[PDB]
UniProtKB/Swiss-Prot annotation, chains A, B:
First and last residue of the signal peptide: none
GO biological process: regulation of DNA-templated transcription
The organism's place on the tree of life at top rank: Archaea
Name by which UniProt lists this protein: Uncharacterized protein MJ0366
InterPro entries: MJ0366-like, Ribbon_hlx_hlx
Originating species: Methanocaldococcus jannaschii (strain ATCC 43067 / DSM 2661 / JAL-1 / JCM 10045 / NBRC 100440)
């Protein structure tokens, strides 16, 4: 129904704060593809840090658009950020 | 040590034969990135078919280059093929 005030939980290879997590999610709005090297690094990284954020309506649709690819893509952005 | 005559085992969303599996692996030699839509589809697909091939020396290095991203990338190629 939208504007559900729910949290999206992610597992990252770095224990980043919500501020950075939210930054990465929004960066995905302009991502069209992921380079093979970046994908390998994100996949091989140990994603053991559980980080969550309560979504705004705008973020809910980004999460819905990405579906199950969200966690990996967020880790890919983190690799690119670093 | 190379030329190990070992099998690489993959899990695909379609029960393709070794002929096609090998085709997809070689196609990855020219892949530089994966589009976001294709990645989501490959991630969300139920990869329940176990398919294996014994690697030639040339294929061993492709597998080594891809590392843990091989299975997902193969599924991405399968999505692109279809």
């Amino acid at each position: 129904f939208m504007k559900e005030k729910k949290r999206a939980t992610f597992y990252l290879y770095k224990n980043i704060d919500g501020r950075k997590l939210r930054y990465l999610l929004h960066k995905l709005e302009n991502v069209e593809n992921v380079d093979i090297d970046t994908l390998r690094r994100a996949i091989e990284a140990e994603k053991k840090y559980k980080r969550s954020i309560t979504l705004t309506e705008e973020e809910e649709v980004i999460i819905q658009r990405l579906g199950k690819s969200a966690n990996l893509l967020l880790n890919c952005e983190l690799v690119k950020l670093d």
